[PDB]
Structure formats: C-alpha cells, structure tokens
Amino acid sequence: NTASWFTALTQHGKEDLKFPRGQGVPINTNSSRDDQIGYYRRATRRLSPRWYFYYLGTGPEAGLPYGANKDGIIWVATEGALNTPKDHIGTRNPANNAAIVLQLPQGTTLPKGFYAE
Ligand SMILES: [Zn+2]
Numbered sequence: 001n002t003a004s005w006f007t008a009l010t011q012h013g014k015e016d017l018k019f020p021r022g023q024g025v026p027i028n029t030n031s032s033r034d035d036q037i038g039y040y041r042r043a044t045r046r047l048s049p050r051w052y053f054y055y056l057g058t059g060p061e062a063g064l065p066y067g068a069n070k071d072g073i074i075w076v077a078t079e080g081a082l083n084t085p086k087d088h089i090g091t092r093n094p095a096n097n098a099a100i101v102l103q104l105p106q107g108t109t110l111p112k113g114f115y116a117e
Contacts, residue, residue, distance in 0.1 A: 002059045002091035006102040008050035009040065013113015017042070017051045017074050020109065024076035026053050027103045035086050036078035037066065051114075053102070057085020 006026045009017065017040055025036045038055040053076075056066060066083055067075050092099065102116050110116070 003094050004052035005092045006053050007099045008052050011049040019076050025078045033080040034082045037081035039073050039075050042072035055086035055089045
C-alpha cells in the first residue's frame with residue numbers, strides 16, 4: 001500500500017532484477033550516506049513487470065532484514081550505508097510528493113532488458 005519515492009524500473013526482458021554489490025540505490029539528495037540501502041520489489045500487475053525501490057525497513061517488506069530471501073525482492077546498498085531501518089525517510093505520500101525520477105550514477109550496469117523507462 002505504501003508508495004516508493006522513485007519511478008519504477010521496467011522489466012522489458014526475461015531475467016529478474018539484480019545489481020552488483022555497492023550498486024543500484026537510486027540517487028536522492030534528500031537522503032544521507034547513512035541512508036543508502038534497501039530493496040527493489042517487483043509489483044503485482046496494475047505486460048513487463050515493474051520494480052520499485054524502498055529504503056531498508058520501509059514499505060511492503062519493512063520487516064525484512066537486508067539480504068533476506070523472498071521471490072520478487074532484491075537488495076542493494078551503497079558503501080557507507082547503515083544497516084538500520086530508515087524510519088525518518090519512510091515511504092512517499094502521493095498527496096504531498098510526486099515520484100522522484102529514478103536515476104543511477106554513471107557507469108552503472110542495468111541488467112539486459114532493464115531501462116530507467
Ligand atoms: Zn537521513
């Protein structure tokens with residue numbers, strides 16, 4: 001029920017989403033180095049699946065610890081991130097804020113059949 005802060009990654013292909021370690025946390029300048037960790041969750045349909053990012057300890061799978069195994073949940077973190085729930089970041093209120101356009105830093109390797117839109 002809680003909304004992601006970011007727009008989705010579209011799964012235009014076959015394989016499930018996955019990133020190298022250290023990669024895949026959306027850019028968000030209203031979040032600190034401590035805050036750069038969480039999960040993408042594949043959504044159940046409204047066609048190509050969409051994956052949405054949530055900060056660790058927020059959202060549909062807030063109760064999961066990092067790296068926990070669940071179908072349609074994959075984990076990402078940046079070096080420096082604290083392994084704690086991001087209660088102060090939370091999830092987005094669509095009444096107050098539009099989705100942030102999901103952007104990843106230069107070089108980042110999106111898997112085959114994924115694009116930011
Ligand atoms: Zn913070």
